[PDB]
Amino acid sequence: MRVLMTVFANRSHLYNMVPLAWALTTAGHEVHIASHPDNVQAISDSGLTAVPVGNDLNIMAALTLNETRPEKLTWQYIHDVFAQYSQIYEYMADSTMTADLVAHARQWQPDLVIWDALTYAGPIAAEAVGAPHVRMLFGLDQWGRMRDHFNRLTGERAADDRHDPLADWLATKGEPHGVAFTESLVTGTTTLAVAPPWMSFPSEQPALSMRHLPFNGPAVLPDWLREAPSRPRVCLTLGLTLRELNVTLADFVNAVADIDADVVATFSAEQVAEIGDLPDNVRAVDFVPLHALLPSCAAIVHHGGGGTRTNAIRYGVPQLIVPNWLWDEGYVAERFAERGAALVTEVPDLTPDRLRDQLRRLIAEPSFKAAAEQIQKEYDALPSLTETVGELVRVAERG
Amino acid sequence: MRVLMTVFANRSHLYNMVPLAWALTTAGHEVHIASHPDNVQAISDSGLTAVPVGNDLNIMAALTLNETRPEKLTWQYIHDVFAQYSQIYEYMADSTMTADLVAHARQWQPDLVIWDALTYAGPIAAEAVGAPHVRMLFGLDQWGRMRDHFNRLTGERAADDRHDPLADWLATKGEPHGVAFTESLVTGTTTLAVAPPWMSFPSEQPALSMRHLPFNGPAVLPDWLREAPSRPRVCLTLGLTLRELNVTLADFVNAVADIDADVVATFSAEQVAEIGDLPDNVRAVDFVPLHALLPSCAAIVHHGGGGTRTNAIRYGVPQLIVPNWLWDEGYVAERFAERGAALVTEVPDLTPDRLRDQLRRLIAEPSFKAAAEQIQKEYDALPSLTETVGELVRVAERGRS
Numbered sequence: 001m002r003v004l005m006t007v008f009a010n011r012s013h014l015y016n017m018v019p020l021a022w023a024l025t026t027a028g029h030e031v032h033i034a035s036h037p038d039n040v041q042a043i044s045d046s047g048l049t050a051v052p053v054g055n056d057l058n059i060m061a062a063l064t065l066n067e068t069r070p071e072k073l074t075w076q077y078i079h080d081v082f083a084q085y086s087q088i089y090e091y092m093a094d095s096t097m098t099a100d101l102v103a104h105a106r107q108w109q110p111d112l113v114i115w116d117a118l119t120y121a122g123p124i125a126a127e128a129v130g131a132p133h134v135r136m137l138f139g140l141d142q143w144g145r146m147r148d149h150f151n152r153l154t155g156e157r158a159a160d161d162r163h164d165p166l167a168d169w170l171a172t173k174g175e176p177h178g179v180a181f182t183e184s185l186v187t188g189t190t191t192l193a194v195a196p197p198w199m200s201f202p203s204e205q206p207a208l209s210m211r212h213l214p215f216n217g218p219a220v221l222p223d224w225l226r227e228a229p230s231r232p233r234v235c236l237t238l239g240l241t242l243r244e245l246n247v248t249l250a251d252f253v254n255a256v257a258d259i260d261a262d263v264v265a266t267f268s269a270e271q272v273a274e275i276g277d278l279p280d281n282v283r284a285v286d287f288v289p290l291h292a293l294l295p296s297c298a299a300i301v302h303h304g305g306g307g308t309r310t311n312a313i314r315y316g317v318p319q320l321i322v323p324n325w326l327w328d329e330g331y332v333a334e335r336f337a338e339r340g341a342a343l344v345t346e347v348p349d350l351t352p353d354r355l356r357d358q359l360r361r362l363i364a365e366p367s368f369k370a371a372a373e374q375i376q377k378e379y380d381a382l383p384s385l386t387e388t389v390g391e392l393v394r395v396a397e398r399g
Numbered sequence: 400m401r402v403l404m405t406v407f408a409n410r411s412h413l414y415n416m417v418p419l420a421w422a423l424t425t426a427g428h429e430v431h432i433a434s435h436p437d438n439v440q441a442i443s444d445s446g447l448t449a450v451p452v453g454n455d456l457n458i459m460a461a462l463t464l465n466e467t468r469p470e471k472l473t474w475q476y477i478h479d480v481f482a483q484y485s486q487i488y489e490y491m492a493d494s495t496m497t498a499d500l501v502a503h504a505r506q507w508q509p510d511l512v513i514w515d516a517l518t519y520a521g522p523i524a525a526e527a528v529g530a531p532h533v534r535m536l537f538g539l540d541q542w543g544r545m546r547d548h549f550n551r552l553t554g555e556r557a558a559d560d561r562h563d564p565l566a567d568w569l570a571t572k573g574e575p576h577g578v579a580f581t582e583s584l585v586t587g588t589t590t591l592a593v594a595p596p597w598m599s600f601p602s603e604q605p606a607l608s609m610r611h612l613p614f615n616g617p618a619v620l621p622d623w624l625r626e627a628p629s630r631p632r633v634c635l636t637l638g639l640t641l642r643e644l645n646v647t648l649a650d651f652v653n654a655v656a657d658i659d660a661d662v663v664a665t666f667s668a669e670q671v672a673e674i675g676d677l678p679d680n681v682r683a684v685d686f687v688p689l690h691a692l693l694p695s696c697a698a699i700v701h702h703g704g705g706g707t708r709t710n711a712i713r714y715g716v717p718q719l720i721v722p723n724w725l726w727d728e729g730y731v732a733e734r735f736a737e738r739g740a741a742l743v744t745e746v747p748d749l750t751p752d753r754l755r756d757q758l759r760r761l762i763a764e765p766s767f768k769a770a771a772e773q774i775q776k777e778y779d780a781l782p783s784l785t786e787t788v789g790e791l792v793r794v795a796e797r798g799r800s
């Protein structure tokens with residue numbers, strides 16, 4: 001079958017759907033990834049076939065989607081979240097990008113469109129040609145969670161007071177293309193999840209579940225990693241957070257290193273500068289593929305993002321999380337912590353000494369490894385990518 | 400499980416194993432691709448994990464393996480082909496590469512080794528750690544065909560008259576790693592075939608067969624491929640063999656283009672200058688992803704190589720083959736001809752008119768499309784890659800205690 005994947009120009013959201021693209025390819029299906037011209041090279045460099053659509057995006061240049069406190073969740077609040085975010089997402093997959101992807105769908109006739117959950121050109125393109133389409137999540141479904149509240153809150157109002165920013169945007173989006181608004185444009189003919197169910201939001205529709213393979217981009221085993229380690233190894237990927245936050249970067253590095261273990265840290269050209277002399281047990285590196293490092297690690301300290309955490313799931317590694325709050329990092333870090341596989345230090349509370357002390361706990365207390373390994377078992381049982389391909393074949397067959 | 404795949408630094412032999420690497424990766428196994436450092440970039444651009452071994456290879460800087468005349472296939476000839484190729488293959492996966500691959504196999508302990516059939520650091524590494532190992536072909540099994548002739552012939556000479564260059568090579572190669580010569584160092588615990596069994600050599604050993612997915616490398620669809628085709632198309636990928644033959648490169652292109660279809664031809668910069676004005680109906684391109692082009696083509700004119708012919712097979716596309724002799728091109732081209740799916744012109748018989756006349760036939764007589772279609776259908780039914788991964792989990796599982 002012909003599968004048209006689409007993702008806005010961002011490497012991380014691309015990497016999200018790369019293993020699936022490959023599962024589809026080796027099952028024999030024809031796969032295109034449509035993205036903005038500034039993401040075509042990353043698509044090519046993952047081994048796949050790119051279809052440029054639209055203009056270069058260059059995305060790297062009190063209304064939150066991640067609000068769960070149920071008194072903040074009023075209809076007006078959610079309505080306004082959807083007013084604000086529809087403009088963000090329109091921007092990320094605009095009417096030129098949408099019109100190119102629709103024209104390619106019309107000529108190529110895909111049987112199935114899979115769209116990254118922030119790439120709203122996809123369902124327009126699929127409905128324009130009558131193809132079913134799968135909304136592919138890239139962490140928790142903040143948007144589906146918000147929309148469930150919204151739709152129900154909306155149902156209980158003067159028929160004349162149910163203004164819907166999502167319906168207006170997507171009717172406008174679809175209208176050059178003869179695509180009429182239906183809720184399926186908001187959330188897919190169906191949805192594909194990448195987070196394990198135990199950390200996920202209750203949902204009104206089920207999503208396909210999947211044992212998510214986290215693709216970490218270009219990867220080379222460095223020689224130093226060919227070593228059996230002499231003790232436990234810690235991986236520190238907090239470059240952005242530490243550089244953003246009396247106490248100096250080198251203060252943090254020092255306190256982190258003051259443990260009975262080897263530290264591998266991803267750090268800047270710039271940042272290796274103002275750390276000055278590195279502790280004898282801290283290797284700084286621009287990048288190390290996480291799948292080749294984590295099998296030898298007792299702990300990972302990171303920002304709580306989907307790729308990194310999915311790596312920690314897969315290799316059973318205890319986490320110290322200093323959450324981002326950029327999509328779902330804070331909810332997900334609490335979940336990890338409630339299951340006893342992580343310790344959490346919110347950025348306002350971040351101090352060199354605190355990083356160090358949770359880190360020593362993660363090495364010394366066997367309960368965190370044990371919780372981590374349990375989470376790994378239950379990840380091991382989620383549907384394989386081959387199962388997921390069969391589901392998507394069915395999705396497509398049904399029309 | 401952990402699959403340690405290994406290939407010498409060569410893009411084609413890598414690509415040959417890219418889709419199997421990925422089938423395994425998305426079935427959930429940990430896959431390492433070990434090659435010389437000059438293949439690392441190619442491995443990353445395929446979306447795979449490179450493990451560098453040995454030093455850069457830089458291979459693009461009487462005695463053949465495609466010899467099939469029975470009177471030439473004496474014991475002394477095969478002996479000497481083995482003596483010579485044992486030196487060439489050592490060069491291609493030398494003591495440093497081998498040592499590096501053995502150290503990594505010791506360290507990472509894979510459940511299966513899958514080695515490109517030309518990469519003899521592979522079975523050695525496997526043996527050092529008792530992993531089963533699967534010798535992966537990249538065309539016909541020329542080496543096993545000769546090895547079976549050689550072992551039969553050797554079996555009945557005088558006992559003192561049974562020099563085996565492969566036994567002497569591989570005993571030497573294995574010795575620093577405590578690895579003993581056994582026939583399985585020559586040909587693998589088992590062999591994975593990439594060519595459809597209808598066109599394969601008979602073997603005195605089993606081979607897993609597979610619906611070989613030909614990976615065409617990095618791919619960006621250009622605007623021109625993405626519009627509706629206005630009339631039938633022909634793919635011409637013969638840039639190399641052409642710029643080696645008073646009869647001019649422009650002449651070959653004029654005749655070949657003199658047919659009732661558009662031509663998409665791959666030419667270098669040097670080639671396009673040397674040909675000058677292109678015919679109206681010819682698009683010269685330095686590269687075009689075959690899986691995106693072929694669905695719209697009535698024929699493909701090419702040199703008979705594995706990757707290209709597997710694409711023609713997959714898309715059911717009639718072929719005009721001008722065989723090179725790098726490996727198995729001559730003998731496969733003859734297999735397709737007999738099935739009716741191709742016309743052949745050897746290098747020695749090649750004129751502009753003969754190429755054009757053959758091309759006109761492929762697009763005019765429906766018997767070629769019919770024959771290519773039938774071949775496609777037999778290909779669609781070979782074991783899938785998912786199936787091949789199961790087969791390969793069985794090798795790993797059976798190969799344990």
Ligand SMILES: Cc1cn([C@H]2C[C@H](O)[C@@H](COP(=O)(O)OP(=O)(O)O)O2)c(=O)[nH]c1=O
Nearest residue numbers: 012214216266287288289290305306307308
């Ligand atoms: C910094 C870094 C990231 N990665 C991985 C983590 C992710 O799977 C992927 C993309 O990075 P990023 O977008 O930071 O991941 P996240 O989803 O954690 O925010 O690359 C490495 O493998 N090695 C590295 O050194």
Ligand SMILES: Cc1cn([C@H]2C[C@H](O)[C@@H](COP(=O)(O)OP(=O)(O)O)O2)c(=O)[nH]c1=O
Nearest residue numbers: 411613615665686687688689704705706707
């Ligand atoms: C030259 C060329 C090759 N390819 C494919 C054919 C092969 O499958 C693959 C590897 O290159 P190559 O080794 O030239 O092909 P072969 O194995 O037929 O000798 O790239 C294209 O898709 N387009 C092109 O223009």
Ligand SMILES: [Mg+2]
Nearest residue numbers: 331334335338
């Ligand atoms: Mg809670």
